[PDB]
Amino acid sequence: PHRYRPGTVALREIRRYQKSTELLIRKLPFQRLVREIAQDFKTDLRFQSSAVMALQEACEAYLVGLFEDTNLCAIHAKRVTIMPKDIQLARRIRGE
Amino acid sequence: KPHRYRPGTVALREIRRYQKSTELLIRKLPFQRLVREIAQDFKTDLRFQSSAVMALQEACEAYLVGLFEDTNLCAIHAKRVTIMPKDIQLARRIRGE
Amino acid sequence: RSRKESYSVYVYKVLKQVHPDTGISSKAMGIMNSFVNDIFERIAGEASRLAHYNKRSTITSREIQTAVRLLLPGELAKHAVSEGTKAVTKYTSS
Amino acid sequence: SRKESYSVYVYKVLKQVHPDTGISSKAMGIMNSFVNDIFERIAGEASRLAHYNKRSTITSREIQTAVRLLLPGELAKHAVSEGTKAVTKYTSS
Amino acid sequence: DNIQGITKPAIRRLARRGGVKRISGLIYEETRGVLKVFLENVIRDAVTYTEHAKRKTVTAMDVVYALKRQGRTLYGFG
Amino acid sequence: DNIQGITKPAIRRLARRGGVKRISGLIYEETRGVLKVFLENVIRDAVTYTEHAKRKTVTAMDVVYALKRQGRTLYGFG
Amino acid sequence: AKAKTRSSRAGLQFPVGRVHRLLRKGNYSERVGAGAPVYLAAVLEYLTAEILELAGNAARDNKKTRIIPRHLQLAIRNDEELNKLLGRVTIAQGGVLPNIQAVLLPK
Amino acid sequence: AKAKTRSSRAGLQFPVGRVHRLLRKGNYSERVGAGAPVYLAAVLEYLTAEILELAGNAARDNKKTRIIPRHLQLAIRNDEELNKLLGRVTIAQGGVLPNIQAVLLPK
DNA sequence: TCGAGAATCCCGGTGCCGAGGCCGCTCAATTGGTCGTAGACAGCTCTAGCACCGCTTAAACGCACGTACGCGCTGTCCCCCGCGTTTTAACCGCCAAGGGGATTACTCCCTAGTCTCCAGGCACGTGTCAGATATATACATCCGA
DNA sequence: TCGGATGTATATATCTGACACGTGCCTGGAGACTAGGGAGTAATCCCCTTGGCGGTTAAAACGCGGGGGACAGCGCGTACGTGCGTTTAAGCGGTGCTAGAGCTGTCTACGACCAATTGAGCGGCCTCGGCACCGGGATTCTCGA
Structure with a gap:
């Protein structure tokens, strides 16, 4: 009955995803999300492909930074898991 | 001696009083001496205006009270009431400094 | 020999326009002048x-x-x- | 459309500091944007x-x-x- | 209906890149809300930048500008 | 030395204004350290500002510039 | 013939001439339009009127007829939008608004 | 006419003439000194040389002879002064320097 | 909940200096005109974004199982708090002085501006090799037997 | 714990599209000269910043009793990690169409420049009213039993 103990697969994923530099959020759903968000600001707006790529890159970098900060908060609170209070305090300290 | 205040009540009165007011907390002369001593190693015998030291101390106090505030929030998040140096160093790390 | 420039008269005028009687201390005067200068600099x-x-x-x-x-x-x-x-259309109407 | 950018200069300084290392197009764009940002900040x-x-x-x-x-x-x-x-050597000419 | 399109595995992958071991199940709603707020702000700035230029296409240049004006600049796009 | 100019009661009052009930022991050394580093940065910027203008007295308005450069505006001094 | 000031022409109180001169001599651009100083002065006047109305309300709350930096600081922070606009400035004689956390309260 | 480029006159690699043109056209001040573009070109060249040497090292120890944005971000973040300078900068197509907190690691 | 003890809002009275109004002076904003050009507008091109259509397969979903641990609870020990008592140096007031910040004048000379000339850099085009993929092999390592 | 199996680092073939380099051209950089106002330099003043002395008192420093809190240990039941089968739709590659960005020509209204001027705004003085400060005492908390 081969089975990896919890945590090891998480560590492998963490190392593999920190070593890599590719784009994580799927492109098409993010493009649709951006189009919907911009739809209520202007009628029938158009978007350049490079603009959507820049939006995705900036948003992913911001999320990675926020998750790193909230992981710091979690390991500060004597635990290894993150819950919404952690990211809430991280945002509040960051000055959102 | 009867009627000794339990810890926390005096602290609560002090915190309410100092939040209500807006006077100067850091003593003027020690801060001015400190800033002169820390600036004398950047340029020899340079002079400081009184309003310059006043503005510097005001910015000092504002930054320090903001930090504390944030570190008190962080300490509260850790199921603690008292701030610890871990809290300030983590708050500084999150603030990017 | 001194010709310092400040928004004191204008902020006082607008204060007396909104609130008929309210004083502004020298510290508050300098603070409002600094705020006006900062907002103007940012927008410009x-x-x-x-x-x-x-x-x-x-x-x-x-x-x-x-x-x-x-x-x-x-x-x-x-x-x-x-x-x-x-304000712009009122000015141009003149 | 004679768009102009710090393209040949970054490559020249790279070939001066490193003899055979090459720069990819994305790296070229990043370096050009960084040069533009630092120049704008200093100016x-x-x-x-x-x-x-x-x-x-x-x-x-x-x-x-x-x-x-x-x-x-x-x-x-x-x-x-x-x-x-650089300024001293330029003025010396 | 579409904000959900940023699904749970994508959030988990982003967090793993961020450097966190375990993830709770209540964080996905919060991170989707954070995503929506941040994208609303940045896209609003980009949209008004385009509206100033009498354009209908949000170019990448104005988006990166708007990010720079937000206080979080970005390279690799000019 | 001259870093003990700010004292234990003074830091206690600063923290009480900041909104914290109880205070540890090493907290004073940590706050003195962070205060020293922040004041060193600001004073370096202000001293360079007053050095550029061929002056040997730091006016308050330089200090205002030094604070503004570090992304912390100050009001009431010019 | 006639010296009708431009500030009264626009129906304002802030100096449109002074902001025009500042824009022109502030090397923001090669040339400045005619309506640009009027728009800028109107925006500045509205912002100042809003912040001063809030400060005066706060002062009247504290049974004082003189606006002081404490009242301005309180009026700025209590209102959410002006707090967001001025969220990185440190007002002299600030005295941050009272705030005690729920857990810290005795029980 | 001798036709001696000012960039080669100052012994630099960055275009001092183009920097001067950008300084003049860019609304910074009504007049720009002669040595200012030379100083700016020198500063830009030194910064680019430092960052490119670091990125070249990060490429060489990665068994690659071509710099990619990942190498540039690794060079920027690994150094201390550059990280402080480029603090708010987000590098497109770059990743993140690998790190794992001590607590999260297994026993 | 019911007692005394302390801490604070409220009120009245007195003084004080800072804000508000007034005055004179000036320099900068307004009138009026002239003139060069920035761009508003119309016309055109044509790169590029959008919608569709189908195929493939990576990725997300749902579910079952286990177990790591987040949280609650309790015990301990310690360590800041409150407070009383001693010490010290901050602060206020006053007095001297001279460093240099701010001002004005003058002359040098640095740089904007223009004309002319030419070559450094850019758009375009083409070779070619650095590296991305795939297969096979050997090492790191993980979790049990 | 050694050991089976999983994942990952390493060598080799290969084929591809992006990078490095050559080439023509033109627009922007450079050589040279002018002229005009910025500022480097020189005095000069008086503002204020440094320095020092006396007191006086608030606040810092020290020390002790102790109760509340930080932290470690332990139990538990749940929420999340991990893996497998199913479902989904993202990503791939073409293909067509046109809304709209980019470029070009023009001519006109709009903003810079400039002489004159006059009144809006600033420097300085004066005054009284809003506010700081002290004494009384009623309310509002806090603590022990």
């Missing part, structure tokens, strides 16, 4: 950047309007835009 | 210093002060030395 810098962004050389009404919509929160931006447009 | 600081000192010109002193304000310690020292050397 944003308008300058916006003029440089389309190879244009004129700071016009649209530049400051977009700068206001950029640097101000929602309700504040809407109210400031309405007030600025009203 | 803005110099302009603020010159205008807010009741002066009307940007000289070597203004940019030296701007680069001492912007860059961190060791980078500021080395950049100031390099700029002074």
Whole structure:
């Protein structure tokens, strides 16, 4: 009955995803999300492909930074898991 | 001696009083001496205006009270009431400094 | 020999316009002057950047309007835009 | 559409510091954007210093002060030395 | 209906890149809300930048600008 | 030395204004350290500002510039 | 013939001439439009009127007829939008608004 | 006419003439000194040389002879002064320097 | 909940200096005109974004199982708090002085501006090799037997 | 714990599209000269910043009793990690169409420049009213039993 103990697969994923530099959020759903968000600001707006790529890159970098900060908060609170209070305090300290 | 205040009540009165007011907390002369001593190693015998030291101390106090505030929030998040140096160093790390 | 420049008379006029009788201390006067200067500098810098962004050389009404919509929160931006447009059209009506 | 950018200069300085290392197109764009951003930052600081000192010109002193304000310690020292050397050698001609 | 399109595995992958071992199940709603707020702000800035230029296409240049004006600049796009 | 100029009661009052009930022991050394580093940065910027203008007295308005450069504006001084 | 000031022409109180001169001599751009100083002065006047109305309300709350930096600081922070606009400035004689956390309260 | 480029006159690699043109056209001040573009070109060249040497090292120890944005971000973040200078900068197509907190690691 | 003890809002009275109004002076904003050009507008091109259509397969979903641990609870020990008592140096007031910040004048000379000339850099085109993929092999390592 | 199996680092073939380099051209940089206002330099003043002395008192420093809190240990039941089968739709590659960005020509209204001027705004003085400060005492908390 081969089975990896919890945590090891998480560590492998963490190392593999920190070593890599590719784009994580799927492109098409993010493009649709951006189009919907911009739809209520202007009628029938158009978007350049490079603009959507820049939006995705900036948003992913911001999320990675926020998750790193909230992981710091979690390991500060004597635990290894993150819950919404952690990211809430991280945002509040960051000055959102 | 009867009627000794339990810890926390005096602290609560002090915190309410100092939040209500807006006077100067850091003593003027020690801060001015400190800033002169820390600036004398950047340029020899340079002079400081009184309003310059006043503005510097005001910015000092504002930054320090903001930090504390944030570190008190962080300490509260850790199921603690008292701030610890871990809290300030983590708050500084999150603030990017 | 001194010709220091400040927004004291104008902020006092607007204060007496909104509140019939309210004093402003010297510290509050300097604070309001600094706030006015900071907001003006921010809006002017944003308008300058916006003029440089389309190879244009004129700071016009649209530049400051977009700068206001950029640097101000929602309700504040809407109210400031309405007030600025009203002032501009009143001036041009003369 | 004669778009202009710091394209050949970054490559030249790279081939000067490293003989065979190449730069990809994305790396070229990143380096060009970084050069543009740093130049704009230093120019803005110099302009603020010159205008807010009741002066009307940007000289070597203004940019030296701007680069001492912007860059961190060791980078500021080395950049100031390099700029002074370049200005002195240019004036010597 | 579409904000959900940023699904749970994508959030988990982003967090793993961020450097966190375990993830709770209540964080996905919060991170989707954070995503929506941040994208609303940045896209509003980009949209008004385009509206100033009498354009209908949000170019990448104005988006990166708007990010820079937000206080979080970005390279690799000019 | 001269870093003990700010004292234990003074830091206690600063923290009480900041909104914290109880205070540890090493907290004073940590706050003195962070205060020293922040004041060193601001004083370096202000001293360079007053050095550029061929002056040997630091006016308050330089200090205002030094604070503004570090992304912390100050009001009531010019 | 006639010296009708431009500030009264626009129906304002802030100096449109002074902001025009500042824009022109502030090297923001090569040239400045005619309506640009009027728009900028109107925006500045509205912002100042809003912040001063809030400060005066706060002062009247504290049974004082003189606006002081404490009242301005309180009026800025209590209102959410002006707090967001001025969220990075440190007002002299600030005295941050009272705030005690729920857990810290005795029980 | 001798036709001696000013960039080669100062012994630099960056275009001092183009920097001077950008300084003049860019609304910074009504007049720009002669040594200012030389100083700016020297500063830009030194910064680019430092960052490119670091990125070249990060490429060489990665068994690759071509710099990619990942190598540039690794060079920027690994150094201390550059990280302080480029603090708010987000590098497109770059990743993140690998790190794992001590607590999260297994026993 | 019911007692005394302390801490604070409220009120009245007195003084004080800072804000508000007034005065005179000036310099900068307004009138009016002239003139060069920035861009508003119309017209055209044509790169590029959008919608569709189908195929493939990576990725997300749902569910079952286990177990790591987040949280609650309790015990301990310690360590800041409150408070009383001693010490010290901050602060206020006053007095001297001279460093240099701010101002004005003058002359040098640095740089904007223009004309002319030419070559450095850019758009375009083409070779070619650095590296991305795939297969096979050997090492790191993980979790049990 | 050694050991089976999983994942990952390493060598080799290969084929591809992006990078490095050559080429023509033109627009922007450079050589040279002018002229005009910025500022470097020189005095001069008086503002204020440094320095020092006396007191006086608030606040810092020290020390002790102790109760509340930080932290470690332990139990538990749940929420999340991990893996497998199913479902989904993202990503791939073409293909067509046109809304709209980019470029070009023009001519006109709009903003810079400039002489004159006059009144809006600033420097300085004066005054009284809003506010700081002290004494009384009623309310509002806090603590022990």
